[PDB]
Amino acid sequence: SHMRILFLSYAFNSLSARLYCELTEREHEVSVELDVHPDLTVEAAELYKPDLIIAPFLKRKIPQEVWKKYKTLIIHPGPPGDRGPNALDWAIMKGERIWGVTLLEASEEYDAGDVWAYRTFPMRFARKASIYANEVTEGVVECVLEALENFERGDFKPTPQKEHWWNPKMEQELRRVDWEQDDTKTVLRKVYASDSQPGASSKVLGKEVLLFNAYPEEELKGKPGEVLALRDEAVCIGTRDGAVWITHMRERKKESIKLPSARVLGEFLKGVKEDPIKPWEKVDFKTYREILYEEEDGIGFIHFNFYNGAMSTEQCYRLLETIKYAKKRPVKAIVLLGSEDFFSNGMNLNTIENAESPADESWRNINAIDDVCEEILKTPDKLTVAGMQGNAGAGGVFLALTCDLVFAREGVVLNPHYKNIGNLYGSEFWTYTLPKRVGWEKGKEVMENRMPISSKKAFEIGLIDGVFGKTPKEFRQRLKERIKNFINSKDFYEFIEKKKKERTSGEWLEEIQKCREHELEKMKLNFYGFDTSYHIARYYFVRA
Ligand SMILES: CC(C)(COP(=O)(O)OP(=O)(O)OC[C@H]1O[C@@H](n2cnc3c(N)ncnc32)[C@H](O)[C@@H]1OP(=O)(O)O)[C@@H](O)C(=O)NCCC(=O)NCCS
């Protein structure tokens, strides 16, 4: 029943984290070993002595020694028979309508072992990272549990492969976006297949770039490869039959990092102008909308789609303005939805790394995100709800904790800690927000744990107020009908009664102001003190 499971992964990536939660919270024992030289590999399997080895995420062969002695199951983001190291890249380039994930045995030939479990699913037209993080991740969880059942039963035999194919590593020539020859659909497919790594190569404004995060543009028209407009640092680029937005780019050099396009293109954008669209405007054609505000049934819904959940200083202020617009609206509740792939991951570490002074940009970013939290907290006459459709970590978790209610989809993974970014003290009113939910003893325990927890475990400990839904869309529906019932009851007014009283009294405003002050002083030491752990850890996070 209580198996001992050793993870071999290249990195402790999102799928490895999700599996870790699913098995850990089922009373199993999981050791994670980030694949090293095959020697530490053999030696660590010796020392740890597992019942079962999972490889959620490998980029090299497991030593024949190890898996001939321990049952070794490999995750493959393809249907049974699909072999190769870029399964999803190829599935998307080839326009596959149906795809799947396979759990197969380790063997001497790459991806040729017998199958222990698989799932199939209809393929969305979407970024690779998002297929991986939703359909692939969910399927892999089902496979592993099934294999765990088949294993503890001891009497299971895997299905040898039959029909099978090999797709080699994909070269950049196949990904290259050629603006004069490629229609919008072809550019979406190329960028989708390279998002978020390695990027689709291209030439923009004479500069050689990698493209990331593409959105079709249905209104603006021009010459293929022309930069039509700017919009919140994205650029709109003419294609063969229309236009496409690209929010993020990377120079094709070694030391450079993904940044907003306007920061990569920089001074080359002299001519082009901004083409704004408020989050509350209504628009009939497909365009790029970073933040979206929509009112349904007396509720204000704020969508914000910050690439990779990273919140730049500037994006914090765009969000704060949409919150201020909502608080002046005929709505009883205000729901922050993030995006379908992330709720939030706190400060944009890439825009911090890129700034002249990362400490100063770190100072701007933490104050801006604190200004968002403060605005949420000081909403005495309205209900506020955090809706975690996707994962969240570091400052993004505590952004959500400032809302009256925090709901999350099933499968959401949380990292309520700064153990990966140099032990930042954190802010976002966590000294107020966190103990009001779990007490100072547990809250500090939460922040000391570098391992993730599911939205399920977070609910159990009282960190959040409810988990439900299997998909983003389901979660959205159930969340709406749950908030809908509450503001249509006498409980809603008896709740604003208390909240109006406390959150306008001077003893509360000064309480929370002393919290923001105490946190920023610790964070100021983190950004400028002698101990440079935070800057060291940011450097490696951003260049991996
Ligand atoms: C939260 C976290 C544990 C999730 O782990 P995970 O499931 O393995 O997800 P990943 O790190 O692989 O995220 C995928 C992408 O999102 C990016 N990303 C996530 N959070 C980011 C952030 N705050 N800033 C910039 N980029 C971020 C990652 O760089 C990664 O980039 P890539 O796809 O180009 O390789 C992890 O992403 C993390 O440590 N983020 C940093 C958050 C932070 O410290 N913010 C500053 C304090 S508020």
Four-residue CA torsion sign, 274, 279, 285, 288:
positive
Judged by DSSP in three states, 32 sits in strand
Q: Name 467's bridge partners.
A: 408
CA–CA separation, 415 vs 447, rounded Å?
A: 9
Whole-number Cα distances in Å, 116 to 17, 66, 148, 463: 21, 19, 10, 36
Query: Phi and psi at residue 142, in whole multiples of 5°?
Result: -65, -50
CA–CA separation, 397 vs 347, rounded Å?
A: 11
Residue 17 near ligand 1, beta carbon < 6 Å: yes
**Residue whose C-alpha is closest to residue 257's, from 166, 178, 352:** 352
Whole-number Cα distances in Å, 397 to 204, 246, 363, 526: 36, 27, 19, 19
Judged by DSSP in three states, 74 sits in strand
Distance 129 CA to ligand 1 centre (A): 13
Mutate to test the pocket of ligand 1, among 308, 367, 398 (most ligand atoms within 8 A of CB): 308
Cβ(353)–Cβ(257) below 8 Å: yes
Q: Token pair 């022309």 is at which residue?
A: 226
Mutate to test the pocket of ligand 1, among 9, 250, 343, 349 (most ligand atoms within 8 A of CB): 349
Exposed/middle/buried for 404, CB within 10 Å: 0-12, 13-18, 19+? middle
CA–CA separation, 484 vs 349, rounded Å?
A: 37
Judged by DSSP in three states, 360 sits in helix
CA–CA separation, 62 vs 104, rounded Å?
A: 13
Distance 308 CA to ligand 1 centre (A): 7
As a whole number of angstroms, the longest Cα–Cα distance in the chain is 72
* Protein residue closest via CA to atom 21 of ligand 1: 310
CA–CA separation, 81 vs 166, rounded Å?
A: 9
Four-residue CA torsion sign, 93, 98, 101, 105:
negative
Exposed/middle/buried for 329, CB within 10 Å: 0-12, 13-18, 19+? middle
Beta-strand pair 299-304/333-338: parallel
Q: Token pair 């017998």 is at which residue?
A: 114
Distance 374 CA to ligand 1 centre (A): 24
Eight-state DSSP code of residue 523: H
CA–CA separation, 46 vs 96, rounded Å?
A: 42
Whole-number Cα distances in Å, 183 to 201, 227, 427: 16, 15, 45
Cβ(140)–Cβ(101) below 8 Å: yes
Give 199's contacts (C-beta < 8 A, 6+ positions apart).
175, 210, 211, 212, 249, 250, 258
Exposed/middle/buried for 70, CB within 10 Å: 0-12, 13-18, 19+? middle
Q: Which two tokens stand for residue 334?
A: 């205000």
Give the 3-state DSSP-derived string for 244-266, with helices as H, strands as E and coil as C.
Answer: EEEEEEEECCCCCCCEEHHHHHH
Q: Which two tokens stand for residue 383?
A: 């209900």
Q: Which two tokens stand for residue 513?
A: 């102001």
CA–CA separation, 411 vs 278, rounded Å?
A: 32
Q: Half-sphere exposure (CA, 13 Å, Cβ side) for 275?
A: 17
Cβ(543)–Cβ(257) below 8 Å: yes
Whole-number Cα distances in Å, 319 to 30, 152, 375, 512: 39, 50, 11, 21
Ordered DSSP codes for 177-222: --TTT--HHHHHHHHHHHTTTT-EEEEETTEEEEEEEEEEESS---
**Residue whose C-alpha is closest to residue 386's, from 428, 418, 351:** 428
Residue 259 near ligand 1, beta carbon < 6 Å: no
- Nearest ligand 1 atom to alpha carbon 18: 7
CA–CA separation, 114 vs 105, rounded Å?
A: 5
- Nearest ligand 1 atom to alpha carbon 418: 44
- Nearest ligand 1 atom to alpha carbon 428: 48
Give the 3-state DSSP-derived string for 97-145, with helices as H, strands as E and coil as C.
Answer: CEEEEEEEECCCCCCCCCEEEEEEEECCCCCHHHHHHHHHHHHHHHHHH
CA–CA separation, 237 vs 39, rounded Å?
A: 49
**Residue whose C-alpha is closest to residue 280's, from 322, 248, 311, 319:** 322
